Amino acid sequence: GGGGIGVSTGTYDNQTTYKFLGDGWVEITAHASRLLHLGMPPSENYCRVTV
Amino acid sequence: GGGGIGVSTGTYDNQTTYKFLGDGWVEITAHASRLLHLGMPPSENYCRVTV
């Protein structure tokens, strides 16, 4: 159904919309979309490191 | 009644009001008030002057 490997699961949107309401009030909706690169953690163990 | 020699007959107003309506529309009402000095016309006759 909605879930599928070949179907996209979201929409890229990065635009700042300005909605002027009244009496000088402004609704500023800021959309931000970015592509993220994640890699394998050097270790899978939590570590107490001392500097 | 409303008319009187000692009563003022108007209000001095010289302010630019900004009324934001919506969708970014602005109603700019500009009030302007000035004191005017008028003197007697050098002549009371219409004149066809040639330069």
Coordinates of all heavy atoms in Angstrom, one line a residue:
Chain A
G1 N 0.8 -1.2 0.0 CA 0.0 0.0 0.0 C 0.9 1.3 0.0 O 1.7 1.4 -0.9
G2 N 0.7 2.1 1.0 CA 1.5 3.3 1.1 C 3.0 3.0 1.2 O 3.8 3.7 0.5
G3 N 3.4 2.0 1.9 CA 4.8 1.5 2.0 C 5.2 0.8 0.7 O 4.5 -0.1 0.3
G4 N 6.4 1.1 0.2 CA 6.9 0.4 -1.0 C 8.4 0.8 -1.2 O 8.7 2.0 -1.0
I5 N 9.2 -0.1 -1.7 CA 10.7 0.2 -1.8 C 10.9 1.1 -3.0 O 11.8 1.9 -3.0 CB 11.5 -1.1 -2.0 CG1 11.1 -1.9 -3.3 CG2 11.4 -2.0 -0.8 CD1 11.9 -3.1 -3.5
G6 N 10.0 1.0 -4.1 CA 10.2 1.9 -5.3 C 9.5 3.2 -5.2 O 9.7 4.0 -6.1
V7 N 8.7 3.4 -4.1 CA 7.9 4.7 -4.0 C 8.6 5.6 -3.1 O 9.3 5.1 -2.1 CB 6.4 4.4 -3.5 CG1 6.4 3.9 -2.1 CG2 5.6 5.6 -3.7
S8 N 8.6 6.9 -3.4 CA 9.2 7.9 -2.5 C 8.4 8.1 -1.2 O 7.2 7.9 -1.3 CB 9.4 9.2 -3.2 OG 10.2 9.1 -4.3
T9 N 9.1 8.4 -0.1 CA 8.4 8.4 1.2 C 8.3 9.9 1.8 O 8.0 10.0 3.0 CB 9.0 7.5 2.2 OG1 10.3 7.9 2.5 CG2 9.0 6.1 1.7
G10 N 8.6 10.9 1.0 CA 8.6 12.3 1.5 C 8.8 13.3 0.3 O 8.9 12.8 -0.8
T11 N 8.8 14.6 0.6 CA 8.9 15.6 -0.4 C 10.0 16.6 0.0 O 10.0 17.0 1.2 CB 7.6 16.3 -0.7 OG1 7.2 17.0 0.5 CG2 6.5 15.4 -1.1
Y12 N 10.9 16.9 -0.9 CA 11.9 17.9 -0.6 C 11.3 19.3 -0.7 O 10.8 19.7 -1.8 CB 13.1 17.8 -1.6 CG 14.3 18.7 -1.3 CD1 15.5 18.1 -0.9 CD2 14.3 20.1 -1.3 CE1 16.6 18.9 -0.6 CE2 15.4 20.8 -1.0 CZ 16.6 20.2 -0.7 OH 17.7 21.0 -0.4
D13 N 11.3 20.1 0.4 CA 10.8 21.4 0.5 C 11.7 22.3 1.3 O 11.9 22.0 2.5 CB 9.4 21.4 1.1 CG 8.6 22.7 0.8 OD1 9.1 23.5 0.0 OD2 7.4 22.8 1.3
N14 N 12.2 23.4 0.7 CA 13.2 24.3 1.3 C 12.8 25.8 1.0 O 13.7 26.5 0.5 CB 14.6 24.0 0.9 CG 15.7 24.3 1.9 OD1 15.8 25.3 2.5 ND2 16.4 23.2 2.2
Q15 N 11.6 26.2 1.3 CA 11.2 27.6 0.9 C 10.6 28.3 2.1 O 9.9 27.7 2.9 CB 10.2 27.5 -0.2 CG 8.9 26.7 0.1 CD 8.2 26.3 -1.1 OE1 8.6 26.7 -2.3 NE2 7.1 25.6 -1.0
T16 N 11.0 29.6 2.3 CA 10.4 30.4 3.4 C 9.2 31.1 2.9 O 9.3 32.0 2.1 CB 11.4 31.4 4.0 OG1 12.6 30.7 4.3 CG2 11.0 32.1 5.2
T17 N 8.0 30.7 3.4 CA 6.7 31.3 3.0 C 6.4 32.5 4.0 O 6.7 32.3 5.2 CB 5.6 30.3 3.0 OG1 6.0 29.2 2.2 CG2 4.3 30.9 2.6
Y18 N 5.9 33.6 3.5 CA 5.5 34.7 4.4 C 4.0 34.9 4.3 O 3.5 35.2 3.2 CB 6.2 36.0 4.1 CG 7.7 36.0 4.4 CD1 8.6 35.2 3.7 CD2 8.2 36.8 5.4 CE1 9.9 35.2 3.9 CE2 9.6 36.8 5.7 CZ 10.4 36.0 4.9 OH 11.8 36.0 5.2
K19 N 3.2 34.6 5.4 CA 1.8 34.8 5.4 C 1.4 36.0 6.3 O 1.5 35.9 7.5 CB 1.1 33.5 6.0 CG -0.5 33.5 5.9 CD -1.1 32.3 6.5 CE -2.6 32.3 6.4 NZ -3.2 31.1 7.0
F20 N 1.0 37.1 5.6 CA 0.6 38.3 6.4 C -0.8 38.1 6.9 O -1.7 38.0 6.0 CB 0.8 39.5 5.4 CG 2.2 39.7 4.9 CD1 2.4 39.5 3.5 CD2 3.2 39.9 5.7 CE1 3.7 39.7 3.0 CE2 4.5 40.1 5.2 CZ 4.7 39.9 3.9
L21 N -1.0 38.2 8.2 CA -2.4 37.9 8.8 C -3.2 39.2 8.9 O -4.3 39.2 8.4 CB -2.1 37.2 10.1 CG -1.1 36.1 10.1 CD1 -0.8 35.6 11.6 CD2 -1.4 35.0 9.2
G22 N -2.6 40.2 9.6 CA -3.4 41.4 9.8 C -2.8 42.2 10.9 O -1.9 41.7 11.6
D23 N -3.2 43.5 11.1 CA -2.7 44.3 12.2 C -1.1 44.3 12.2 O -0.5 44.6 13.2 CB -3.2 44.0 13.6 CG -4.8 44.0 13.6 OD1 -5.4 43.2 12.8 OD2 -5.3 44.8 14.4
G24 N -0.6 43.8 11.0 CA 0.9 43.8 10.9 C 1.5 42.5 11.4 O 2.7 42.4 11.5
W25 N 0.7 41.5 11.7 CA 1.2 40.1 12.2 C 1.6 39.3 11.0 O 0.9 39.3 10.0 CB 0.2 39.5 13.1 CG 0.1 40.1 14.4 CD1 -1.0 40.7 15.0 CD2 1.1 40.1 15.4 NE1 -0.7 41.1 16.2 CE2 0.6 40.7 16.5 CE3 2.4 39.6 15.5 CZ2 1.3 40.9 17.7 CZ3 3.2 39.8 16.6 CH2 2.6 40.4 17.7
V26 N 2.8 38.6 11.1 CA 3.3 37.8 9.9 C 3.6 36.4 10.4 O 4.3 36.2 11.4 CB 4.6 38.5 9.3 CG1 5.0 37.7 8.1 CG2 4.4 40.0 9.0
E27 N 3.0 35.4 9.7 CA 3.3 34.0 10.0 C 4.5 33.5 9.1 O 4.2 33.3 7.9 CB 2.1 33.2 9.8 CG 2.3 31.7 10.1 CD 1.0 30.9 9.9 OE1 -0.1 31.5 9.6 OE2 1.0 29.6 10.1
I28 N 5.7 33.4 9.7 CA 6.8 33.0 8.8 C 7.1 31.5 8.9 O 7.6 31.1 10.0 CB 8.1 33.8 9.2 CG1 7.8 35.3 9.3 CG2 9.3 33.5 8.3 CD1 9.0 36.2 9.6
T29 N 6.7 30.7 7.9 CA 6.9 29.3 7.9 C 8.2 29.0 7.1 O 8.2 29.2 5.9 CB 5.7 28.5 7.3 OG1 4.5 29.0 8.0 CG2 5.8 27.0 7.4
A30 N 9.2 28.5 7.8 CA 10.5 28.2 7.1 C 10.6 26.7 6.9 O 10.7 25.9 7.9 CB 11.6 28.7 8.0
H31 N 10.6 26.3 5.6 CA 10.8 24.8 5.3 C 12.3 24.6 5.0 O 12.9 25.5 4.3 CB 9.9 24.4 4.1 CG 8.5 24.6 4.3 ND1 7.9 25.8 4.4 CD2 7.5 23.7 4.4 CE1 6.5 25.7 4.5 NE2 6.3 24.4 4.6
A32 N 12.8 23.6 5.5 CA 14.3 23.2 5.3 C 14.4 21.7 5.0 O 13.9 20.9 5.8 CB 15.1 23.6 6.5
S33 N 15.0 21.4 3.8 CA 15.3 20.0 3.5 C 16.7 19.8 3.1 O 17.3 20.7 2.4 CB 14.4 19.6 2.3 OG 13.0 19.8 2.6
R34 N 17.4 18.7 3.7 CA 18.8 18.5 3.4 C 19.0 17.0 3.2 O 18.3 16.2 3.8 CB 19.7 18.9 4.6 CG 19.5 20.4 5.0 CD 20.0 21.4 4.0 NE 19.2 22.6 4.0 CZ 19.7 23.8 4.3 NH1 21.0 24.0 4.5 NH2 18.9 24.8 4.4
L35 N 20.0 16.6 2.3 CA 20.4 15.2 2.2 C 21.5 14.8 3.2 O 22.5 15.6 3.3 CB 20.9 15.0 0.7 CG 21.5 13.6 0.5 CD1 20.4 12.5 0.5 CD2 22.3 13.6 -0.8
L36 N 21.3 13.8 4.0 CA 22.3 13.5 5.1 C 23.0 12.2 4.7 O 22.4 11.2 4.2 CB 21.5 13.3 6.4 CG 21.2 14.5 7.2 CD1 22.4 15.4 7.3 CD2 20.1 15.3 6.5
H37 N 24.4 12.2 5.0 CA 25.2 11.0 4.8 C 25.6 10.4 6.1 O 26.2 11.1 6.9 CB 26.4 11.3 3.9 CG 27.3 10.2 3.7 ND1 28.1 9.6 4.7 CD2 27.7 9.5 2.6 CE1 28.8 8.6 4.2 NE2 28.6 8.5 2.9
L38 N 25.2 9.2 6.4 CA 25.5 8.5 7.7 C 26.4 7.3 7.4 O 26.1 6.6 6.4 CB 24.2 8.1 8.4 CG 24.4 7.4 9.7 CD1 25.0 8.3 10.8 CD2 23.1 6.8 10.2
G39 N 27.4 7.1 8.2 CA 28.3 6.0 8.0 C 28.3 5.1 9.3 O 27.7 5.5 10.3
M40 N 29.0 3.9 9.2 CA 29.1 3.0 10.3 C 29.9 3.6 11.4 O 30.9 4.2 11.2 CB 29.7 1.7 9.9 CG 28.7 0.6 9.5 SD 29.6 -1.0 9.1 CE 31.2 -0.4 8.6
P41 N 29.4 3.5 12.7 CA 30.2 4.0 13.8 C 31.5 3.2 14.0 O 31.4 2.0 14.0 CB 29.3 3.7 15.1 CG 27.9 3.5 14.5 CD 28.1 2.9 13.1
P42 N 32.7 3.9 14.2 CA 33.9 3.2 14.2 C 33.8 2.0 15.2 O 34.4 1.0 15.0 CB 34.9 4.2 14.8 CG 34.1 5.4 15.2 CD 32.9 5.3 14.3
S43 N 33.0 2.2 16.3 CA 32.8 1.1 17.3 C 31.3 1.1 17.6 O 30.7 2.1 17.5 CB 33.6 1.3 18.5 OG 33.3 0.4 19.5
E44 N 30.8 -0.1 18.0 CA 29.4 -0.3 18.4 C 29.3 -0.3 19.9 O 28.3 -0.6 20.4 CB 28.8 -1.6 17.8 CG 28.9 -1.7 16.3 CD 28.9 -3.1 15.8 OE1 28.8 -4.0 16.6 OE2 29.0 -3.2 14.5
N45 N 30.4 0.1 20.6 CA 30.4 0.1 22.0 C 30.4 1.5 22.6 O 31.2 2.3 22.1 CB 31.7 -0.7 22.5 CG 31.7 -2.1 22.1 OD1 30.8 -2.6 21.4 ND2 32.8 -2.8 22.4
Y46 N 29.6 1.7 23.6 CA 29.6 3.0 24.3 C 31.0 3.1 25.0 O 31.4 2.1 25.6 CB 28.5 3.2 25.4 CG 27.1 3.4 24.8 CD1 26.5 2.4 24.0 CD2 26.4 4.6 25.0 CE1 25.2 2.6 23.5 CE2 25.2 4.8 24.5 CZ 24.6 3.8 23.7 OH 23.3 4.0 23.2
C47 N 31.7 4.2 25.0 CA 33.1 4.3 25.5 C 33.3 5.5 26.5 O 32.9 6.6 26.1 CB 34.1 4.4 24.4 SG 34.0 3.1 23.2
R48 N 33.8 5.3 27.7 CA 34.1 6.4 28.6 C 35.5 6.9 28.2 O 36.5 6.4 28.8 CB 34.0 6.0 30.0 CG 34.3 7.1 31.1 CD 34.1 6.5 32.5 NE 35.0 5.5 32.8 CZ 36.2 5.7 33.3 NH1 36.5 6.8 33.9 NH2 37.1 4.7 33.2
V49 N 35.6 7.9 27.3 CA 37.0 8.4 26.9 C 37.4 9.6 27.7 O 36.6 10.4 28.0 CB 36.9 8.8 25.4 CG1 35.5 9.1 24.9 CG2 37.9 9.8 25.0
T50 N 38.7 9.6 28.1 CA 39.2 10.7 28.9 C 40.2 11.6 28.1 O 41.2 11.0 27.6 CB 39.9 10.2 30.2 OG1 39.0 9.2 30.8 CG2 40.4 11.2 31.1
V51 N 40.0 12.9 28.1 CA 41.0 13.8 27.4 C 41.7 14.5 28.5 O 41.1 15.2 29.2 CB 40.3 14.7 26.4 CG1 41.3 15.7 25.8 CG2 39.6 13.9 25.3
Chain B
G1 N -25.3 76.9 17.2 CA -25.2 75.4 17.3 C -23.7 75.0 16.9 O -22.8 75.5 17.6
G2 N -23.6 74.2 15.9 CA -22.3 73.7 15.4 C -21.4 74.9 15.0 O -20.2 75.0 15.4
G3 N -22.0 75.9 14.3 CA -21.3 77.1 13.9 C -21.1 78.0 15.0 O -22.1 78.3 15.7
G4 N -19.9 78.6 15.2 CA -19.6 79.6 16.2 C -18.3 80.3 16.0 O -17.4 79.5 15.5
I5 N -18.2 81.6 16.3 CA -16.9 82.3 16.0 C -15.8 81.8 17.0 O -14.6 81.8 16.6 CB -17.1 83.8 16.1 CG1 -17.5 84.3 17.5 CG2 -18.1 84.3 15.0 CD1 -17.6 85.8 17.6
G6 N -16.2 81.5 18.2 CA -15.2 81.1 19.2 C -14.9 79.6 19.2 O -13.9 79.2 19.9
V7 N -15.6 78.8 18.4 CA -15.4 77.3 18.4 C -14.5 77.0 17.2 O -14.7 77.6 16.2 CB -16.7 76.5 18.4 CG1 -17.5 76.7 17.1 CG2 -16.5 75.1 18.7
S8 N -13.6 76.0 17.4 CA -12.8 75.5 16.2 C -13.6 74.8 15.2 O -14.6 74.1 15.6 CB -11.6 74.7 16.7 OG -10.8 75.4 17.6
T9 N -13.3 74.8 13.9 CA -14.1 74.2 12.9 C -13.4 73.0 12.2 O -13.9 72.6 11.2 CB -14.6 75.2 11.8 OG1 -13.4 75.7 11.2 CG2 -15.3 76.4 12.5
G10 N -12.3 72.5 12.8 CA -11.6 71.4 12.2 C -10.5 70.9 13.1 O -10.3 71.4 14.2
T11 N -9.8 69.8 12.7 CA -8.7 69.2 13.5 C -7.4 69.1 12.7 O -7.5 68.6 11.6 CB -9.1 67.9 14.1 OG1 -9.3 67.0 13.0 CG2 -10.4 67.9 14.9
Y12 N -6.3 69.6 13.3 CA -5.0 69.4 12.6 C -4.6 67.9 12.7 O -4.3 67.5 13.8 CB -3.9 70.3 13.2 CG -2.6 70.4 12.5 CD1 -2.2 71.6 11.9 CD2 -1.8 69.3 12.4 CE1 -1.0 71.7 11.2 CE2 -0.6 69.4 11.7 CZ -0.2 70.6 11.1 OH 1.0 70.7 10.5
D13 N -4.4 67.3 11.6 CA -3.9 65.9 11.5 C -2.9 65.7 10.4 O -3.3 65.9 9.3 CB -5.1 64.9 11.4 CG -4.8 63.5 11.8 OD1 -3.7 63.3 12.3 OD2 -5.6 62.6 11.6
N14 N -1.7 65.3 10.8 CA -0.6 65.1 9.8 C 0.2 63.8 10.0 O 1.4 63.9 10.2 CB 0.4 66.3 9.8 CG 1.0 66.7 8.5 OD1 1.6 65.9 7.8 ND2 0.8 67.9 8.2
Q15 N -0.5 62.7 10.0 CA 0.2 61.4 10.4 C -0.1 60.4 9.3 O -1.2 60.3 8.8 CB -0.3 60.9 11.8 CG -1.8 60.7 11.9 CD -2.2 60.6 13.3 OE1 -1.4 60.8 14.2 NE2 -3.5 60.5 13.5
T16 N 0.9 59.6 8.9 CA 0.7 58.5 7.9 C 0.4 57.2 8.7 O 1.3 56.7 9.3 CB 1.9 58.3 7.0 OG1 2.2 59.6 6.4 CG2 1.7 57.3 5.9
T17 N -0.8 56.7 8.6 CA -1.2 55.5 9.2 C -1.0 54.3 8.3 O -1.3 54.5 7.1 CB -2.7 55.5 9.7 OG1 -2.9 56.7 10.5 CG2 -3.2 54.3 10.4
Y18 N -0.5 53.2 8.8 CA -0.4 52.0 7.9 C -1.3 50.9 8.4 O -1.1 50.4 9.5 CB 1.1 51.5 7.9 CG 2.0 52.4 7.2 CD1 2.4 53.6 7.7 CD2 2.6 52.0 6.0 CE1 3.3 54.5 7.1 CE2 3.5 52.8 5.3 CZ 3.9 54.1 5.9 OH 4.8 54.9 5.2
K19 N -2.3 50.5 7.6 CA -3.3 49.4 8.0 C -3.0 48.2 7.1 O -3.3 48.2 5.9 CB -4.7 49.9 7.8 CG -5.8 48.9 8.3 CD -7.2 49.4 8.1 CE -8.2 48.4 8.5 NZ -9.6 48.9 8.2
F20 N -2.4 47.1 7.8 CA -2.1 45.9 7.0 C -3.4 45.1 7.0 O -3.9 44.7 8.1 CB -0.9 45.2 7.7 CG 0.3 46.0 7.9 CD1 0.8 46.4 9.1 CD2 1.0 46.4 6.7 CE1 1.9 47.2 9.2 CE2 2.1 47.2 6.9 CZ 2.6 47.6 8.1
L21 N -3.9 44.8 5.8 CA -5.2 44.1 5.6 C -5.0 42.6 5.6 O -5.6 41.9 6.4 CB -5.8 44.6 4.3 CG -5.7 46.1 4.1 CD1 -6.3 46.5 2.8 CD2 -6.5 46.9 5.2
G22 N -4.1 42.1 4.7 CA -3.9 40.6 4.6 C -3.3 40.3 3.2 O -3.2 41.2 2.4
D23 N -2.9 39.0 3.0 CA -2.3 38.6 1.8 C -1.2 39.6 1.4 O -0.8 39.6 0.2 CB -3.3 38.4 0.7 CG -4.4 37.4 1.0 OD1 -5.1 37.7 2.0 OD2 -4.5 36.4 0.3
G24 N -0.8 40.5 2.3 CA 0.3 41.4 2.0 C -0.2 42.8 1.5 O 0.6 43.6 1.1
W25 N -1.5 43.0 1.6 CA -2.1 44.3 1.1 C -2.0 45.3 2.3 O -2.3 45.0 3.4 CB -3.6 44.0 0.7 CG -3.6 43.4 -0.7 CD1 -4.1 42.2 -1.0 CD2 -3.2 43.9 -1.9 NE1 -4.0 41.9 -2.3 CE2 -3.4 43.0 -2.9 CE3 -2.6 45.1 -2.3 CZ2 -3.1 43.2 -4.3 CZ3 -2.2 45.3 -3.6 CH2 -2.5 44.4 -4.6
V26 N -1.7 46.5 1.9 CA -1.5 47.6 2.9 C -2.3 48.8 2.6 O -2.2 49.3 1.4 CB 0.0 48.0 3.1 CG1 0.2 49.0 4.2 CG2 0.9 46.8 3.3
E27 N -3.1 49.3 3.5 CA -3.9 50.5 3.2 C -3.2 51.7 3.8 O -3.1 51.9 5.1 CB -5.3 50.4 3.9 CG -6.2 51.6 3.7 CD -7.6 51.5 4.3 OE1 -7.9 50.4 4.8 OE2 -8.4 52.4 4.2
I28 N -2.5 52.5 3.0 CA -1.7 53.7 3.5 C -2.5 55.0 3.5 O -2.7 55.5 2.4 CB -0.4 53.8 2.7 CG1 0.3 52.5 2.6 CG2 0.5 54.9 3.3 CD1 1.6 52.5 1.8
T29 N -3.0 55.4 4.6 CA -3.8 56.6 4.7 C -2.8 57.8 5.2 O -2.3 57.7 6.3 CB -5.0 56.5 5.7 OG1 -5.7 55.3 5.3 CG2 -5.9 57.7 5.7
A30 N -2.6 58.7 4.3 CA -1.7 59.8 4.6 C -2.5 61.1 4.9 O -3.2 61.6 4.0 CB -0.8 60.1 3.4
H31 N -2.4 61.5 6.2 CA -3.1 62.8 6.6 C -2.1 63.9 6.5 O -0.9 63.8 6.9 CB -3.6 62.7 8.0 CG -4.6 61.6 8.2 ND1 -4.3 60.2 8.2 CD2 -5.9 61.6 8.5 CE1 -5.4 59.5 8.4 NE2 -6.4 60.3 8.6
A32 N -2.5 65.1 5.9 CA -1.6 66.2 5.8 C -2.4 67.5 6.2 O -3.5 67.7 5.7 CB -1.1 66.3 4.4
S33 N -1.8 68.3 7.1 CA -2.4 69.5 7.6 C -1.4 70.6 7.5 O -0.3 70.4 7.9 CB -3.0 69.4 9.0 OG -3.9 68.3 9.0
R34 N -1.8 71.8 6.9 CA -0.8 72.9 6.8 C -1.6 74.3 7.1 O -2.8 74.3 6.8 CB -0.3 73.0 5.4 CG 0.4 71.8 4.9 CD 1.7 71.5 5.6 NE 1.9 70.0 5.7 CZ 2.9 69.4 5.2 NH1 3.9 70.0 4.6 NH2 3.0 68.0 5.2
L35 N -0.9 75.3 7.7 CA -1.5 76.6 7.9 C -1.2 77.4 6.6 O 0.0 77.5 6.2 CB -0.9 77.2 9.1 CG -1.2 78.7 9.3 CD1 -2.7 78.9 9.7 CD2 -0.3 79.3 10.4
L36 N -2.2 78.1 6.1 CA -2.0 78.8 4.8 C -2.2 80.3 5.0 O -3.1 80.7 5.8 CB -3.1 78.3 3.8 CG -2.7 77.1 3.0 CD1 -1.3 77.2 2.4 CD2 -2.8 75.8 3.8
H37 N -1.3 81.1 4.4 CA -1.4 82.6 4.5 C -1.9 83.1 3.2 O -1.2 82.9 2.1 CB -0.1 83.2 4.9 CG -0.1 84.7 5.0 ND1 -0.2 85.5 3.9 CD2 0.0 85.5 6.0 CE1 -0.2 86.8 4.2 NE2 -0.1 86.8 5.5
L38 N -3.1 83.8 3.1 CA -3.6 84.4 1.9 C -3.7 85.9 2.0 O -4.1 86.4 3.1 CB -5.0 83.8 1.6 CG -5.7 84.3 0.4 CD1 -5.0 83.9 -0.9 CD2 -7.1 83.9 0.3
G39 N -3.3 86.6 1.0 CA -3.3 88.1 1.0 C -4.2 88.7 -0.1 O -4.7 87.9 -0.9
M40 N -4.4 90.0 0.0 CA -5.3 90.6 -1.0 C -4.7 90.5 -2.4 O -3.5 90.8 -2.5 CB -5.6 92.1 -0.7 CG -6.8 92.3 0.1 SD -7.1 94.1 0.4 CE -5.5 94.7 0.3
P41 N -5.4 90.2 -3.5 CA -4.8 90.1 -4.8 C -4.4 91.6 -5.3 O -5.2 92.5 -5.1 CB -6.0 89.7 -5.7 CG -7.0 89.0 -4.8 CD -6.8 89.8 -3.5
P42 N -3.2 91.8 -5.8 CA -2.8 93.1 -6.2 C -3.9 93.8 -7.0 O -4.1 95.0 -6.8 CB -1.6 92.9 -7.1 CG -1.6 91.4 -7.4 CD -2.2 90.8 -6.2
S43 N -4.6 93.1 -7.8 CA -5.8 93.7 -8.6 C -7.0 92.7 -8.5 O -6.8 91.5 -8.3 CB -5.4 93.9 -10.0 OG -6.5 94.3 -10.7
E44 N -8.2 93.3 -8.5 CA -9.4 92.4 -8.5 C -9.9 92.2 -9.9 O -11.1 91.8 -10.1 CB -10.5 93.1 -7.7 CG -10.0 93.4 -6.2 CD -10.8 94.5 -5.6 OE1 -11.7 95.1 -6.2 OE2 -10.5 94.8 -4.4
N45 N -9.1 92.6 -10.9 CA -9.5 92.5 -12.3 C -8.8 91.3 -13.0 O -7.6 91.2 -12.8 CB -9.2 93.8 -13.1 CG -10.0 95.0 -12.5 OD1 -10.7 94.8 -11.5 ND2 -9.7 96.1 -13.0
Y46 N -9.5 90.5 -13.8 CA -8.8 89.5 -14.6 C -8.0 90.2 -15.7 O -8.5 91.2 -16.2 CB -9.8 88.5 -15.3 CG -10.5 87.5 -14.3 CD1 -11.4 88.0 -13.3 CD2 -10.3 86.2 -14.5 CE1 -12.0 87.1 -12.5 CE2 -11.0 85.3 -13.7 CZ -11.8 85.7 -12.6 OH -12.4 84.8 -11.8
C47 N -6.8 89.8 -15.9 CA -5.9 90.6 -16.8 C -5.3 89.7 -17.9 O -4.7 88.6 -17.5 CB -4.8 91.2 -16.1 SG -5.4 92.3 -14.7
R48 N -5.3 90.1 -19.2 CA -4.6 89.3 -20.2 C -3.2 89.8 -20.4 O -3.0 90.8 -21.2 CB -5.4 89.4 -21.6 CG -4.8 88.6 -22.7 CD -5.7 88.8 -24.0 NE -5.8 90.1 -24.5 CZ -4.9 90.7 -25.3 NH1 -4.2 90.0 -26.1 NH2 -4.8 92.0 -25.3
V49 N -2.3 89.3 -19.6 CA -0.9 89.8 -19.6 C 0.0 89.1 -20.7 O -0.2 87.8 -20.8 CB -0.2 89.6 -18.2 CG1 -0.9 88.5 -17.4 CG2 1.3 89.5 -18.3
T50 N 0.8 89.8 -21.4 CA 1.6 89.2 -22.5 C 3.1 89.3 -22.1 O 3.6 90.4 -21.8 CB 1.5 90.0 -23.8 OG1 0.1 90.0 -24.1 CG2 2.2 89.3 -25.0
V51 N 3.8 88.2 -22.1 CA 5.3 88.2 -21.8 C 6.0 88.0 -23.1 O 5.8 86.9 -23.8 CB 5.7 87.1 -20.8 CG1 7.2 87.0 -20.6 CG2 5.0 87.4 -19.4

